Amino acid sequence: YTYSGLFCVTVNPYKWLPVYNAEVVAAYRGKKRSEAPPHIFSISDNAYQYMLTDRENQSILITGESGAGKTVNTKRVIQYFASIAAGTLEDQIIQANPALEAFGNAKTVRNDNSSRFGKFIRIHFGATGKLASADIETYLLEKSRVIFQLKAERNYHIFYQILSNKKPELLDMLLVTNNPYDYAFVSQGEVSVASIDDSEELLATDSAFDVLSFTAEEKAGVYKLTGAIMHYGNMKFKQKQREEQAEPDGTEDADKSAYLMGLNSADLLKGLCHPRVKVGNEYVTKGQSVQQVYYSIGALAKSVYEKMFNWMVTRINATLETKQPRQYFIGVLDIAGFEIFDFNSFEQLCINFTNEKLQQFFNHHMFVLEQEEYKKEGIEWEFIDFGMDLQACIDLIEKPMGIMSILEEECMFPKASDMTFKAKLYDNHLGKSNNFQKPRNVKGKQEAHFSLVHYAGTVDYNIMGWLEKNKDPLNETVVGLYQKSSLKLMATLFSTKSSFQTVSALHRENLNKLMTNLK
Amino acid sequence: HIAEDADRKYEEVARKLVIIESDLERAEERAELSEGKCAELEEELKTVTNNLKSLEAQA
Amino acid sequence: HIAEDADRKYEEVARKLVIIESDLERAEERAELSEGKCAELEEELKTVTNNLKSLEAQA
Amino acid sequence: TTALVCDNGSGLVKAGFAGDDAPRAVFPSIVGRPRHQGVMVGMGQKDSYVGDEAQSKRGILTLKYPIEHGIITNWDDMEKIWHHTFYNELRVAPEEHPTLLTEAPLNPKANREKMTQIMFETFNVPAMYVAIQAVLSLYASGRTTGIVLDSGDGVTHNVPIYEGYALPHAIMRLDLAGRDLTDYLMKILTERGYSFVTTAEREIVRDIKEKLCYVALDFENEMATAASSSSLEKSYELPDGQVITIGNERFRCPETLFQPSFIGMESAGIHETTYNSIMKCDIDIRKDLYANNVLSGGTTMYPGIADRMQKEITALAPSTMKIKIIAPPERKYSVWIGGSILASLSTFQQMWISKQEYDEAGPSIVHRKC
Ligand SMILES: Nc1ncnc2c1ncn2[C@@H]1O[C@H](COP(=O)(O)OP(=O)(O)O)[C@@H](O)[C@H]1O
């Protein structure tokens, strides 16, 4: 254990220690952080004191991309909170956690179980300080993973868990084989990692579905959704002969998907091949090139997966909720950390921007606390805000002329290529920014295309393929198809005087939402 | 008077309905036959396009 | 009683008449759409066949 | 802050917000004034009706289009139409939105000067901009190269683009469009007995044109076929019963686009002016122009117009080029779609004409710079 100014640096010991148990050490009750030995339980007690003495919500931000130490630390702190403000809520949390483990985790090139989303546990307290039920909140998800995967990686486990050929009832209900190389949305990188078995994962997930209030339909339907997303991966279309219009060739996968989701094959095919718009008070069809329809298919799969995920989140939050009216809570913000790999890509840019925002947030916090302390001792000393200004210049990415802005601009721009994108970037930022610099590509490494100076060093990125990552033209016709499907889970998902949606936009807005949640 | 008037004119309405239904069935036959013939025609066109592109490559 | 019963049966039959007319016009517009396109691509086939023949002469 | 896109046109106003997929408001560009006495005291009679309110009351009104051939010839009526578009159709405040207006190429400069002066003074837009309809149509087609043929209600024009460079010396503008076809059809229907003389009757004939007319692939044998059998005759029902049946008028009306001598014009058909605009371009880009003819506007919506166009241009061009007529299914709103795309670009936000620039330079800035 270690104190660092305002942080709390702890190291995983790999060794059982009674430094946590029994309460003989958990006697920190009433103390401050400065006087006791530097234990995180003292931090949790300080959080208790603060939330009780100011009636203000508190926040816990741990770095999480470390494989272990995240798990045990979360467990021990939530156990501490269970103890202080006293089949427990911790049991309840770790019961259905396989849901999140199987949906929001996949093998990363430098990991084997990585949370690709943010976990923000809200553990609630009574008006006087007795623990209440706890509702967890999830946030932005790396949903581009649904379609595209780099080499030596793979998307979310649940696909491979199912594909483990464990329960043939599923693989037959979904009319699906066991070869992963036949379904493209998962077979881009590696089909399996030998560091884990998938049968035990499927069984853990089945147990999680059972302990949850899921019925036969609330399990087989999710399996159907995943199977249909996988059968999307090999939908094939051709230009109509002599003209510019996508035409289908083979409808086997279309039959599978129409049967699965409770849809029509012809209706699906035409609504994909003939989008329609509400023009004033009228309806007119739109023509489509093949690539546009493929964009539509990918966006459909992404939205299906995302809303299914969110609905399971709400289901779990309900299943762990039964309690009298409450007021106050403590925020437990788990989040991925910074990434510096040997081949950085767009998703890494997103994650680095998220971490940039969080770090500037922390810097603002420490800045204001230090300024307070300096006002306290009558110590006259003023300075440029350490919290915002030094980093406000490295968020060019958010200014609607910066990197991601120009990215969407090109996404809408016709015939836009990665070379044209690089040209526009260099026009707008080369030399006019100090943080924007040209990468040093020395033969022996993969080529980068630009370099930014973050707080975590100077990062280099390779812009190849980013238009495919950011474009999300949603097809409202198939949305209407979904909103009527016989598969009741589909309708429950999509119950509630379009062609422009970008992953960058939604990512940025969810980030700002979480920032407002914190501030 | 009004009842028998409505009776007669709306039986004639049903007669026009017989006419329109007959012509609708005829138009369904026309549509299906035409789309089948024109699927045959599109087979001819795709085949002759293959022919022309192959043969012009050779040329 | 007779009069109102007649009127209601009649109005239902007529409100089926109107949808039959709509489906009739839809069928005939689809058939003429088809046939017109089919003769236009028939002319296209004639052109490509003439090119096929000229190309045979070239071969 | 979002921006407004207000493709005006001479027959239909299409407005909406930059960033949508289709215009939010589409109504006729028409102003109606009461024609008759008015006897019901207390009815609250208005002075004038605009948009499609003037269309449902058209039985008692005399309708006037404030735009004749792409040129705005009545500025009070145009002000009424803009006021309606902003306040009753879109329900916004023009003081909080840049506005992207649109204009046909090669029309008087006073048109744009008055447009920008009207906007900045009687609406207080923060900024505005006047695009060219063909460029926006090309934006919406997802291309950077092609000869676009726009044909709305007032004017038909070709603009050839290459790699994003316009060839302003090859722009060809023609003044027969939807409205002249409507008038020709009003004149041709009299030889069967039907007489439409009122402006409301002109609207009726416009609807007949939009529903029953098509372009014949071969005009002469189509004429002979209509003479021989009677399978080409359809029927239309006026809004008082009284069905009418038309025969060869169906394809004699839009044929005027290919033989403008039917209405006593000396110009050439649209196929021939397209070919001439191409042959006025540098010999290196015309092979790529031949394969990117982009059709746009309402008057290009007749059935069979793309096939006839391709047949004619193929007969004109050398026998080695690949003529491709690109006719999207939503080509009637291509100008608005492209306008929204353009007004949404990040690199465009410096092209607006801010209020301050106008205050410095007068209304003459619109073409002097932008
Ligand atoms: N389906 C159709 N078939 C033939 N002509 C049409 C059709 N729809 C509209 N038009 C013609 O297009 C004109 C309106 O086209 P539009 O592009 O809106 O004009 P503008 O661009 O000047 O507003 C009308 O005059 C009408 O005659």
Side-chain angles (χ1 to χ4, degrees), chain A residues 194-217:
Chain A
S195 65
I196 189 57
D197 183 74
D198 304 67
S199 157
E200 59 162 278
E201 297 296 328
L202 190 152
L203 270 295
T205 52
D206 284 5
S207 65
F209 296 139
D210 285 298
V211 65
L212 286 171
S213 178
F214 286 166
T215 66
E217 313 86 311

mmCIF file of all heavy atoms in Angstrom, chain A residues 194-217:
data_model
loop_
_atom_site.group_PDB
_atom_site.id
_atom_site.type_symbol
_atom_site.label_atom_id
_atom_site.label_comp_id
_atom_site.label_asym_id
_atom_site.label_seq_id
_atom_site.Cartn_x
_atom_site.Cartn_y
_atom_site.Cartn_z
ATOM 1 N N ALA A 194 -5.939 -20.409 -26.221
ATOM 2 C CA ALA A 194 -5.739 -21.601 -25.410
ATOM 3 C C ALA A 194 -5.595 -21.298 -23.925
ATOM 4 O O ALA A 194 -5.473 -22.236 -23.129
ATOM 5 C CB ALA A 194 -4.508 -22.366 -25.900
ATOM 6 N N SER A 195 -5.615 -20.029 -23.527
ATOM 7 C CA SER A 195 -5.484 -19.659 -22.127
ATOM 8 C C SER A 195 -6.791 -19.784 -21.359
ATOM 9 O O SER A 195 -6.842 -19.404 -20.186
ATOM 10 C CB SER A 195 -4.954 -18.229 -22.006
ATOM 11 O OG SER A 195 -5.881 -17.299 -22.536
ATOM 12 N N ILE A 196 -7.840 -20.315 -21.987
ATOM 13 C CA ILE A 196 -9.140 -20.438 -21.341
ATOM 14 C C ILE A 196 -9.976 -21.420 -22.145
ATOM 15 O O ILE A 196 -9.874 -21.487 -23.372
ATOM 16 C CB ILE A 196 -9.835 -19.057 -21.212
ATOM 17 C CG1 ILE A 196 -11.091 -19.165 -20.348
ATOM 18 C CG2 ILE A 196 -10.163 -18.483 -22.580
ATOM 19 C CD1 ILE A 196 -10.832 -19.725 -18.971
ATOM 20 N N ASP A 197 -10.789 -22.201 -21.443
ATOM 21 C CA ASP A 197 -11.768 -23.066 -22.082
ATOM 22 C C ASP A 197 -13.110 -22.352 -22.178
ATOM 23 O O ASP A 197 -13.458 -21.514 -21.342
ATOM 24 C CB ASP A 197 -11.923 -24.376 -21.310
ATOM 25 C CG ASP A 197 -12.877 -25.338 -21.989
ATOM 26 O OD1 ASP A 197 -12.496 -25.934 -23.018
ATOM 27 O OD2 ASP A 197 -14.011 -25.496 -21.494
ATOM 28 N N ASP A 198 -13.873 -22.706 -23.208
ATOM 29 C CA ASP A 198 -15.150 -22.064 -23.475
ATOM 30 C C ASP A 198 -16.344 -22.820 -22.917
ATOM 31 O O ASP A 198 -17.390 -22.211 -22.695
ATOM 32 C CB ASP A 198 -15.342 -21.878 -24.985
ATOM 33 C CG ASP A 198 -14.207 -21.106 -25.628
ATOM 34 O OD1 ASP A 198 -13.076 -21.638 -25.674
ATOM 35 O OD2 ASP A 198 -14.446 -19.970 -26.092
ATOM 36 N N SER A 199 -16.213 -24.129 -22.686
ATOM 37 C CA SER A 199 -17.321 -24.897 -22.126
ATOM 38 C C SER A 199 -17.649 -24.436 -20.711
ATOM 39 O O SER A 199 -18.816 -24.198 -20.377
ATOM 40 C CB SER A 199 -16.986 -26.388 -22.143
ATOM 41 O OG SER A 199 -17.737 -27.089 -21.168
ATOM 42 N N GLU A 200 -16.626 -24.318 -19.861
ATOM 43 C CA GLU A 200 -16.854 -23.821 -18.509
ATOM 44 C C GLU A 200 -17.402 -22.401 -18.527
ATOM 45 O O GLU A 200 -18.203 -22.039 -17.661
ATOM 46 C CB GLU A 200 -15.561 -23.883 -17.700
ATOM 47 C CG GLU A 200 -14.422 -23.076 -18.291
ATOM 48 C CD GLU A 200 -13.325 -22.802 -17.285
ATOM 49 O OE1 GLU A 200 -13.474 -21.851 -16.488
ATOM 50 O OE2 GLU A 200 -12.319 -23.541 -17.282
ATOM 51 N N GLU A 201 -16.997 -21.591 -19.507
ATOM 52 C CA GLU A 201 -17.560 -20.253 -19.627
ATOM 53 C C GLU A 201 -19.039 -20.302 -19.978
ATOM 54 O O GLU A 201 -19.843 -19.572 -19.387
ATOM 55 C CB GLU A 201 -16.792 -19.454 -20.675
ATOM 56 C CG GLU A 201 -15.340 -19.218 -20.318
ATOM 57 C CD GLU A 201 -15.178 -18.373 -19.072
ATOM 58 O OE1 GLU A 201 -16.039 -17.506 -18.820
ATOM 59 O OE2 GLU A 201 -14.186 -18.578 -18.344
ATOM 60 N N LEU A 202 -19.411 -21.151 -20.940
ATOM 61 C CA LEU A 202 -20.818 -21.331 -21.273
ATOM 62 C C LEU A 202 -21.609 -21.774 -20.053
ATOM 63 O O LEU A 202 -22.736 -21.316 -19.834
ATOM 64 C CB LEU A 202 -20.965 -22.348 -22.407
ATOM 65 C CG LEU A 202 -22.341 -22.497 -23.068
ATOM 66 C CD1 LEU A 202 -22.202 -22.951 -24.511
ATOM 67 C CD2 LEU A 202 -23.233 -23.469 -22.309
ATOM 68 N N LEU A 203 -21.034 -22.663 -19.243
ATOM 69 C CA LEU A 203 -21.763 -23.168 -18.083
ATOM 70 C C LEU A 203 -21.894 -22.104 -17.003
ATOM 71 O O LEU A 203 -22.943 -21.988 -16.359
ATOM 72 C CB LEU A 203 -21.081 -24.421 -17.532
ATOM 73 C CG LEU A 203 -21.555 -25.751 -18.125
ATOM 74 C CD1 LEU A 203 -23.013 -25.987 -17.769
ATOM 75 C CD2 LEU A 203 -21.370 -25.800 -19.630
ATOM 76 N N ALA A 204 -20.838 -21.318 -16.785
ATOM 77 C CA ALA A 204 -20.932 -20.193 -15.863
ATOM 78 C C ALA A 204 -22.000 -19.207 -16.315
ATOM 79 O O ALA A 204 -22.776 -18.697 -15.498
ATOM 80 C CB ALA A 204 -19.575 -19.501 -15.741
ATOM 81 N N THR A 205 -22.071 -18.944 -17.621
ATOM 82 C CA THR A 205 -23.070 -18.009 -18.126
ATOM 83 C C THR A 205 -24.478 -18.578 -17.999
ATOM 84 O O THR A 205 -25.425 -17.845 -17.695
ATOM 85 C CB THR A 205 -22.765 -17.654 -19.578
ATOM 86 O OG1 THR A 205 -22.606 -18.856 -20.341
ATOM 87 C CG2 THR A 205 -21.488 -16.842 -19.651
ATOM 88 N N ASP A 206 -24.637 -19.879 -18.240
ATOM 89 C CA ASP A 206 -25.929 -20.522 -18.027
ATOM 90 C C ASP A 206 -26.357 -20.403 -16.573
ATOM 91 O O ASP A 206 -27.511 -20.070 -16.277
ATOM 92 C CB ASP A 206 -25.860 -21.986 -18.456
ATOM 93 C CG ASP A 206 -25.885 -22.149 -19.961
ATOM 94 O OD1 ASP A 206 -25.863 -21.120 -20.668
ATOM 95 O OD2 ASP A 206 -25.931 -23.301 -20.436
ATOM 96 N N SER A 207 -25.437 -20.685 -15.650
ATOM 97 C CA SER A 207 -25.721 -20.497 -14.234
ATOM 98 C C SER A 207 -26.121 -19.060 -13.927
ATOM 99 O O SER A 207 -27.034 -18.826 -13.126
ATOM 100 C CB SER A 207 -24.504 -20.901 -13.405
ATOM 101 O OG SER A 207 -23.408 -20.039 -13.665
ATOM 102 N N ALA A 208 -25.451 -18.088 -14.548
ATOM 103 C CA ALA A 208 -25.798 -16.689 -14.326
ATOM 104 C C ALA A 208 -27.206 -16.389 -14.823
ATOM 105 O O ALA A 208 -27.972 -15.676 -14.164
ATOM 106 C CB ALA A 208 -24.778 -15.782 -15.011
ATOM 107 N N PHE A 209 -27.557 -16.913 -15.996
ATOM 108 C CA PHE A 209 -28.911 -16.738 -16.507
ATOM 109 C C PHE A 209 -29.933 -17.375 -15.581
ATOM 110 O O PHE A 209 -31.045 -16.855 -15.422
ATOM 111 C CB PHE A 209 -29.027 -17.335 -17.908
ATOM 112 C CG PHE A 209 -28.175 -16.648 -18.934
ATOM 113 C CD1 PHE A 209 -27.486 -17.383 -19.884
ATOM 114 C CD2 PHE A 209 -28.060 -15.271 -18.952
ATOM 115 C CE1 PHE A 209 -26.699 -16.757 -20.828
ATOM 116 C CE2 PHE A 209 -27.276 -14.639 -19.896
ATOM 117 C CZ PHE A 209 -26.595 -15.383 -20.834
ATOM 118 N N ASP A 210 -29.573 -18.499 -14.960
ATOM 119 C CA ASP A 210 -30.504 -19.188 -14.070
ATOM 120 C C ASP A 210 -30.714 -18.408 -12.778
ATOM 121 O O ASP A 210 -31.853 -18.221 -12.335
ATOM 122 C CB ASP A 210 -30.007 -20.603 -13.777
ATOM 123 C CG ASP A 210 -30.201 -21.541 -14.951
ATOM 124 O OD1 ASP A 210 -31.364 -21.764 -15.341
ATOM 125 O OD2 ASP A 210 -29.196 -22.052 -15.486
ATOM 126 N N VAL A 211 -29.625 -17.956 -12.147
ATOM 127 C CA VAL A 211 -29.768 -17.180 -10.918
ATOM 128 C C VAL A 211 -30.503 -15.874 -11.193
ATOM 129 O O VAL A 211 -31.234 -15.370 -10.333
ATOM 130 C CB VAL A 211 -28.398 -16.940 -10.256
ATOM 131 C CG1 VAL A 211 -27.516 -16.071 -11.125
ATOM 132 C CG2 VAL A 211 -28.574 -16.308 -8.884
ATOM 133 N N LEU A 212 -30.329 -15.308 -12.384
ATOM 134 C CA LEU A 212 -31.139 -14.173 -12.786
ATOM 135 C C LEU A 212 -32.570 -14.617 -13.062
ATOM 136 O O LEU A 212 -32.870 -15.806 -13.198
ATOM 137 C CB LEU A 212 -30.546 -13.498 -14.019
ATOM 138 C CG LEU A 212 -29.293 -12.666 -13.752
ATOM 139 C CD1 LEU A 212 -28.654 -12.228 -15.058
ATOM 140 C CD2 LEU A 212 -29.632 -11.466 -12.883
ATOM 141 N N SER A 213 -33.455 -13.643 -13.163
ATOM 142 C CA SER A 213 -34.866 -13.936 -13.367
ATOM 143 C C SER A 213 -35.184 -14.378 -14.782
ATOM 144 O O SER A 213 -36.374 -14.429 -15.119
ATOM 145 C CB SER A 213 -35.708 -12.714 -12.999
ATOM 146 O OG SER A 213 -37.083 -12.954 -13.237
ATOM 147 N N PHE A 214 -34.189 -14.686 -15.612
ATOM 148 C CA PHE A 214 -34.452 -15.075 -16.989
ATOM 149 C C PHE A 214 -35.275 -16.353 -17.057
ATOM 150 O O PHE A 214 -35.072 -17.289 -16.280
ATOM 151 C CB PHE A 214 -33.145 -15.272 -17.755
ATOM 152 C CG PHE A 214 -32.449 -13.995 -18.099
ATOM 153 C CD1 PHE A 214 -31.136 -14.007 -18.529
ATOM 154 C CD2 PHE A 214 -33.109 -12.783 -18.005
ATOM 155 C CE1 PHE A 214 -30.489 -12.836 -18.851
ATOM 156 C CE2 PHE A 214 -32.470 -11.608 -18.325
ATOM 157 C CZ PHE A 214 -31.157 -11.634 -18.749
ATOM 158 N N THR A 215 -36.209 -16.382 -18.000
ATOM 159 C CA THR A 215 -37.001 -17.566 -18.281
ATOM 160 C C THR A 215 -36.324 -18.363 -19.394
ATOM 161 O O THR A 215 -35.164 -18.126 -19.741
ATOM 162 C CB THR A 215 -38.426 -17.175 -18.662
ATOM 163 O OG1 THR A 215 -38.409 -16.465 -19.907
ATOM 164 C CG2 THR A 215 -39.030 -16.280 -17.596
ATOM 165 N N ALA A 216 -37.045 -19.331 -19.961
ATOM 166 C CA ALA A 216 -36.552 -20.000 -21.157
ATOM 167 C C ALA A 216 -36.421 -19.017 -22.313
ATOM 168 O O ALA A 216 -35.449 -19.070 -23.076
ATOM 169 C CB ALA A 216 -37.480 -21.156 -21.534
ATOM 170 N N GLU A 217 -37.387 -18.107 -22.451
ATOM 171 C CA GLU A 217 -37.339 -17.132 -23.534
ATOM 172 C C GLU A 217 -36.272 -16.077 -23.282
ATOM 173 O O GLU A 217 -35.570 -15.667 -24.212
ATOM 174 C CB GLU A 217 -38.709 -16.478 -23.711
ATOM 175 C CG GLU A 217 -39.870 -17.456 -23.728
ATOM 176 C CD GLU A 217 -40.383 -17.781 -22.340
ATOM 177 O OE1 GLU A 217 -39.558 -18.112 -21.463
ATOM 178 O OE2 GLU A 217 -41.611 -17.714 -22.126
#
